[PDB]
Each structure stands twice: as C-alpha cells, then as structure tokens.
Amino acid sequence: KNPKSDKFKVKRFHHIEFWCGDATNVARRFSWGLGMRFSAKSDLSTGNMVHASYLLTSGDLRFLFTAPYSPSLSAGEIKPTTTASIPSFDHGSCRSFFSSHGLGVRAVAIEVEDAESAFSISVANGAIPSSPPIVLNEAVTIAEVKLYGDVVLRYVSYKAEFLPGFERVEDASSFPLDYGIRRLDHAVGNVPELGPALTYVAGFTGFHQFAEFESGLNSAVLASNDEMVLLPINEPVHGTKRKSQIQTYLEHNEGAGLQHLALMSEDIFRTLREMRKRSSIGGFDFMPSPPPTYYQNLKKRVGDVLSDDQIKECEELGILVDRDDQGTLLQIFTKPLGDRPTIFIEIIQRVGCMMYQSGGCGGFGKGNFSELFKSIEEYEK
Amino acid sequence: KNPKSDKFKVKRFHHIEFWCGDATNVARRFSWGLGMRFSAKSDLSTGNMVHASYLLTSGDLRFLFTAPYSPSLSAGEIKPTTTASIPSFDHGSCRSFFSSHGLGVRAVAIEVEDAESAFSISVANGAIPSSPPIVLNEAVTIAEVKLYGDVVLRYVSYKAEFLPGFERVEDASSFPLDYGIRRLDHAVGNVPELGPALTYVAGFTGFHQFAEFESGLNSAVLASNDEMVLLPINEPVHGTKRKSQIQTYLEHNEGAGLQHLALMSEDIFRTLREMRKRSSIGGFDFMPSPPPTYYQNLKKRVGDVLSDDQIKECEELGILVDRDDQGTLLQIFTKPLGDRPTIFIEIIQRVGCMMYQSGGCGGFGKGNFSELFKSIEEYEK
Ligand SMILES: Cc1nn(C)c(O)c1C(=O)c1ccc2c(c1C)c(=O)n(-c1cncc(Cl)c1)c(=O)n2C
Ligand SMILES: Cc1nn(C)c(O)c1C(=O)c1ccc2c(c1C)c(=O)n(-c1cncc(Cl)c1)c(=O)n2C
Ligand SMILES: [Co+2]
Ligand SMILES: [Co+2]
Numbered sequence: 001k002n003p004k005s006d007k008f009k010v011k012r013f014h015h016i017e018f019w020c021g022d023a024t025n026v027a028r029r030f031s032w033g034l035g036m037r038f039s040a041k042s043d044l045s046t047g048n049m050v051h052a053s054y055l056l057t058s059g060d061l062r063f064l065f066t067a068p069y070s071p072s073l074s075a076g077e078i079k080p081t082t083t084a085s086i087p088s089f090d091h092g093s094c095r096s097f098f099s100s101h102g103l104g105v106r107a108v109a110i111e112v113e114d115a116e117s118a119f120s121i122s123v124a125n126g127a128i129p130s131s132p133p134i135v136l137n138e139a140v141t142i143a144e145v146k147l148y149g150d151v152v153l154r155y156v157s158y159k160a161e162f163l164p165g166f167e168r169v170e171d172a173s174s175f176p177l178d179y180g181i182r183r184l185d186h187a188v189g190n191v192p193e194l195g196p197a198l199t200y201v202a203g204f205t206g207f208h209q210f211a212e213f214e215s216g217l218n219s220a221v222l223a224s225n226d227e228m229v230l231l232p233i234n235e236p237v238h239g240t241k242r243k244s245q246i247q248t249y250l251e252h253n254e255g256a257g258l259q260h261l262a263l264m265s266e267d268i269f270r271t272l273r274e275m276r277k278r279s280s281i282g283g284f285d286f287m288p289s290p291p292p293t294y295y296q297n298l299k300k301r302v303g304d305v306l307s308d309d310q311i312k313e314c315e316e317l318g319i320l321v322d323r324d325d326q327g328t329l330l331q332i333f334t335k336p337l338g339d340r341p342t343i344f345i346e347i348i349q350r351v352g353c354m355m356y357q358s359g360g361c362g363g364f365g366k367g368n369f370s371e372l373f374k375s376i377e378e379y380e381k
Numbered sequence: 382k383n384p385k386s387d388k389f390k391v392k393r394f395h396h397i398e399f400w401c402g403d404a405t406n407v408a409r410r411f412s413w414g415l416g417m418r419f420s421a422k423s424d425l426s427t428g429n430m431v432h433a434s435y436l437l438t439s440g441d442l443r444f445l446f447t448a449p450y451s452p453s454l455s456a457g458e459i460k461p462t463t464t465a466s467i468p469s470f471d472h473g474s475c476r477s478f479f480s481s482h483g484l485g486v487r488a489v490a491i492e493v494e495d496a497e498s499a500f501s502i503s504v505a506n507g508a509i510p511s512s513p514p515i516v517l518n519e520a521v522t523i524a525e526v527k528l529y530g531d532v533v534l535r536y537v538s539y540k541a542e543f544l545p546g547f548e549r550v551e552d553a554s555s556f557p558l559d560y561g562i563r564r565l566d567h568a569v570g571n572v573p574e575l576g577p578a579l580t581y582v583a584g585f586t587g588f589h590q591f592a593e594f595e596s597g598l599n600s601a602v603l604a605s606n607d608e609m610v611l612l613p614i615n616e617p618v619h620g621t622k623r624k625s626q627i628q629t630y631l632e633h634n635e636g637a638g639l640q641h642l643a644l645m646s647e648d649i650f651r652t653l654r655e656m657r658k659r660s661s662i663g664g665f666d667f668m669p670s671p672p673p674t675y676y677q678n679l680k681k682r683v684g685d686v687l688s689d690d691q692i693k694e695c696e697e698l699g700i701l702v703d704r705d706d707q708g709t710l711l712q713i714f715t716k717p718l719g720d721r722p723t724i725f726i727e728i729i730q731r732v733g734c735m736m737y738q739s740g741g742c743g744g745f746g747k748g749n750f751s752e753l754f755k756s757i758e759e760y761e762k
Pocket of ligand 4: 567569641643745
C-alpha cells in the first residue's frame, strides 16, 4: 500500500556530505577504496576561506567531504560577505560534530522541486529548522532541517555543476576510476527510540511506511511517493544474549546518527572484486564471510534466479542473497569506515520488479539474519 | 666543526606521531601513497578505550597515526587504571591540537639510552616538560618535552615490538608495500623567530649547529653528536616581493609547528615512479616540475656524479639536485599532505661521504633556490 502522501515534490537522492577534520585524506581514501572520481572542489584555491569541500562521484552517487579551515582565515567576514560555498557551514558546529561523533555523515541531501517550499511545509509540519532557505547565485536553493541526532535532511532545488562556487577539478588530477557503483539506494539512521523518530520524520515529510517482507534491532522504512528515496531507521533490541549492534553504535557515536549507506552497483561482482583487491592497500575491509553452508543452501532459495556459476561466484566474494515476494537482493557490508564501530557501507544490487526498476525491490535483507544463524548452526554440525 | 656536546646519549630517530581526527583514513591514505606497511595497532580490538593508534613502517621509518575515541568510553578510568598505550595522550590536548592545526605532527621521537635521564637533564637545562618519564611494562621508558609550538620532542629508551600494548597486525591485513623509503633524514620546524627557538632547543639538548654550504626564510640545523638526528628550524623573511611560505605556514597552521619531513630513499627514482603512479588514485601530489632549462644546466653542475641517462631520468620525475663540498643531494617535495598549506614531505637520496654514510651529506638543497630562479629566467628567454 502506497498512499503517496509526500507533502512536497521529492525527486532523488542528491548527495551525502561527510563532516571530517581533514577532507583531503578521507576523500582520497574513499576515492581509491570505492572507485569514485574527484569531480568538484571548493577550497582555498577557489577562494573559499571557510571550509574545504571535495566531491566524489560514481554514476549518480555524490559523496561530499568537508572540513573547516582555521576560523582566523575568515575572521573578517560576516554571513553577507562569506566566502563559504555551503552557507549552512559553521566552524563551531563542524568541530563539535566531529569531536563528538568522529567521521560521519552530516547531511542527507535530496533534490526537490522547490527547496524553499519544502522547508516551509516541513517546518509547518513539525520539522526542526536547521538552516533557512538560501538562494545560491540565483540558481540553486538549499535548506536544512534536523533529521535525527546531529544529521540534517538537506533540500536542494535547481531553477534550470554541483553547487555555485564549486570548480570542476582538472582532469590531470581527476583519474576516471569506476568499480560499477551507480547510485545511493538507501540511508539508514540509528536512534534510541524508533517510534518518536518515525513520527517526527514521517510527520514533516509525508513519507509513508514501506512494506517489509534474534537480530538486535527493530526498524522501519520511510519512503517517498515513487519509493526512490528510502530512509530506514533502527532502534536497539535490548536484553538479548548478544549485545545489540545498534546500541553499540549509539554508545560509540555519542547518540543517534547515520548507520549505513547502501550503494547500488550495476555489477556487484565486478564492484566486489575491485574493492576486495584494494582492501589491504588503502581501501575498505569487508564483513567476515559466512560459512560455506550458507552457500550450500541458497541454491534451494534462489536457484531459479542465479546460475550455479553465479552462486559460486557469490561464495568467493562473500555476497549475501535475500528474496522478497517480488525481487531478489544481493548485498555485502564493509567494516566500519573509520576508527569507531559506527558508520559502514553496504553494496547492493537488485534483481526484478521491472515496469525502470521499482525501489526496494527485494527488500533490505532482514531475512539473512535467521538464514545466517541457521547456516552457522549447520556449519558447526 | 662538531663539538659533540650532546648533553645525553642520542641514538636515532625512532618515530613520528601524527595527531588526527580519524587515524584509520589518514593511515590508509599514507600507506598507499608512500608504500608503507601496516605493522602495529593499539585500539579497541587491543583493549585501548582511549585512543586509536596505527603504526606504518618502511625500512626504519615509523609513522604513527593517533586519534581520540569518545571520552565516554574511558570516563571510569584514572591515570593509574588507564587503557591508553601512550600514557602522554590526552583527549583535550589532542582535540585542541587538531582543531587548531589540522592534521599535523605531534611528536618527534628520538631513541635515547635513558629516557628518564634525558628528560631530567633536558628540564635541568631549560626544556619545558610535557609529559614526565613513564616506564611501560618494565620494558620501555617514554618522556616528552616541548620542542616548538604544540610539537613535543619524545624520548624513548629500551631496557633490552613498537611499544607495550601494541599488537602486530595480522598480515592478511598487512600487505608488504615498499617504494624504497628507508628512514627519516630530517624534520623541520617553522617558528616566528629563529633565535629564541634555536637557543631553547640547543640549550637543553646540547645539539650543535650543522655547517651549511631571495628565498623566504632564514634557517639553521641542529644536529646530534654523530649528526644522524637533524632538526632544522626556519623563520620567515618578511618584506619580500613574494610572500614567505614560512609566514603562510604560520598563518594557516595557527603558529609554529613541523613544516616538512624528509624521508631517505635507497632508490629515489623507483620511489618517485611508484609515488607518481598513485598521485591521482589516493596518493600524494608533487610540486610542479622545474623548467627543462634547469635540466639543461645540471650536466654543468653534477655531470661527474650522474650519467646523461640519470639526469634525463631526473627530468621525467621532476627531481632537484644540489651539491655540497662533500656530497650530492637528490630531492623532491610533495604538495601539502592535508587540507591546509602547512606540512609536506620531501623525498631525498644522498650520494657521497662514505667512511656508512655521514649525515647531512650534500646539505639540504638551499642552493636550488637561486638555481631555480636562474633557470626560470633562462626558460623565459
Ligand atoms: C537490517 C536492515 N534493515 N534495513 C532497512 C536495512 O538496510 C538493513 C541492512 O542493510 C542489513 C540487512 C542484513 C544484515 C545487516 C544489515 C545492516 C547487518 O548489519 N548484519 C550484521 C553484520 N556484522 C555484525 C552485526 Cl551485529 C550484524 C547482518 O548479519 N545482516 C544479515
Ligand atoms: C631550505 C631547506 N632548509 N633545510 C634545512 C631544508 O631541509 C630545506 C629543504 O628541504 C628545502 C630545500 C630547497 C627548496 C625547498 C625546501 C623545503 C622548498 O620548499 N621550495 C619551495 C617549493 N614550493 C613553494 C615554495 Cl614558496 C618553496 C624550493 O623551491 N626549494 C629549492
Ligand atoms: Co541496508
Ligand atoms: Co629538507
């Protein structure tokens, strides 16, 4: 059931902004590790005396990495005279965020028809304002409201390349890496209590609950009208034998925040070969692989969608497979992206639900919990 | 002239510690960019609830990258009960350093015979104490005194692998990269006034002035008895046509600090080929190459030490060459390692002064200033 109750017109995920202490090093690590090209910059070389911001792209996926310069460089400026290319940036806010959470997502940015209207309607409907609508070079409007913890939902709209004040990077310094990643599929937040977070966010967006089908979580997925913008939220399940990873997140993150980014690949086998090649030479590590009994059981579960060659190719790369009533999902998870056991990345590919492909096709892999438990028992035997 | 006036017994450079906000990402970038292997860790997985520290090694070169966890993880501990593997670490100090300077060197660590005696003698002779001598697992003693700005000189001594509490890393996650870098040759600080910084540091160490032969600096090199520990210091030359890069450093760094690390390569041609291969895929960028007139002039300057093939091979990689009265120096400089125009790395190789090779052989390349100026004029013509 899809009531299509969006309170304003939402298009797609536009970008994800990380707040760091040094944007250069994080960005270069991510670029090599995920096969994303350097495509735009806003920094000292472009006249920005406030923050350094570097954009990585792969397909439609846009990762923005931002860090503050010394406030002394811009002590003379006022908001009307600022050289910051992202007007919502605040030195104090950024340093506070990073010292409290470490490396993490500050903004989930969705493109809308009218950022000003989206902000006004949102705030009219309970959204806590974070940064008012600002019009950039009469071309782009940006606005921000609080999402959960210190994460904001950022509205972007275009009258008619990233943002004004960003320069395209010299493609001597722009190597065309690409491991097949194409777009952001979903972005997941961890909160201490799911109910009030859902009510708040659904309240100001009109996003509806996406239909789902002893893991440590309860969760729910908010979706836009066409279900291309997907914003799941988890809370911990306490009192279990094994400690909830959601709770472990909240402890090490100092509260609520974004837990994982799921990036869609057009060829998850090529992506995972390319990423695993680089795990120990600057890239990303992956979750420990499941026991081969897991692979000795998915011919009986998806043997009509994957050949015996492809299911074995899943066993090399450590891919998990799950199935809705309408589609199939291939997925794998990185180890945490930074020092703390907080944010991580998920690579996914969806098979089915062709009309274009409809969003959420195959679900989000919650079935792999009991399947991995089951498999672990059978591998012990 | 070498008076050999060391007030205590100094052996060699032991390690360089960077203070960052996320040690994982900086360390992985450096590892890939410089060809350094991951060799030890101290973090949550080893019981350290205070800081994450990751050691990279290449030959004798040791880079340590450290970042703070949330203070909440160790709120119950006291210094006697600490799980920190580096007892001098302080959450507040580290966050303050990084927000003030950004990514940068916190400690220049030299190995001594007796860290306790070196600290006592140093403080007796004017050194500002930073962290008293602490004995680690009855095996290693560490002590710290202020060097300049927020940089400390760290004394390490061993009774008889990095430090207690560090674990060797699983060499599944330890890929044996190596681009030829072998040891730290010198470590250079920028200060607003050279005189008082020299007097202070020479005052408590007994290090002597290393004999040297419109650049924006005045400098001087302090050296230990065998001149293997080399600690140059610069100050800006003001009032010039072109603004002093030392002054630009002090502005963007918020004061004094370490300016560059010079790393010795056993094959600077292989190192520079390997590093330049990776510049645009996660590694380090290099200074813009000098005009070919520079290369059309060094046959007349070092044509007796480098063949015509090797001097052309210098022209590909952008290597600079300078000459003392006793040796020859090959050198090149990276662009700054992080967001700010502050710290950078120098790769060098020295040719001559064989007895082992004596330190400082060939100098530090100050002659390349007027040679580059001259060359630039001749290339205009
Ligand atoms: C759930 C969920 N709901 N929504 C809306 C999503 O997008 C998701 C997921 O992506 C998803 C799906 C299956 C997973 C995991 C995740 C994050 C996961 O994290 N782990 C896990 C790995 N290592 C240590 C621990 Cl404690 C747990 C698993 O085993 N499975 C099977
Ligand atoms: C000097 C010095 N003294 N001691 C003790 C040392 O170790 C050094 C050096 O290493 C050294 C030697 C030659 C250099 C440079 C450096 C750091 C340098 O930085 N630059 C430069 C590059 N790009 C922009 C600007 Cl403004 C300046 C140059 O041109 N030359 C020729
Ligand atoms: Co997911
Ligand atoms: Co030097």
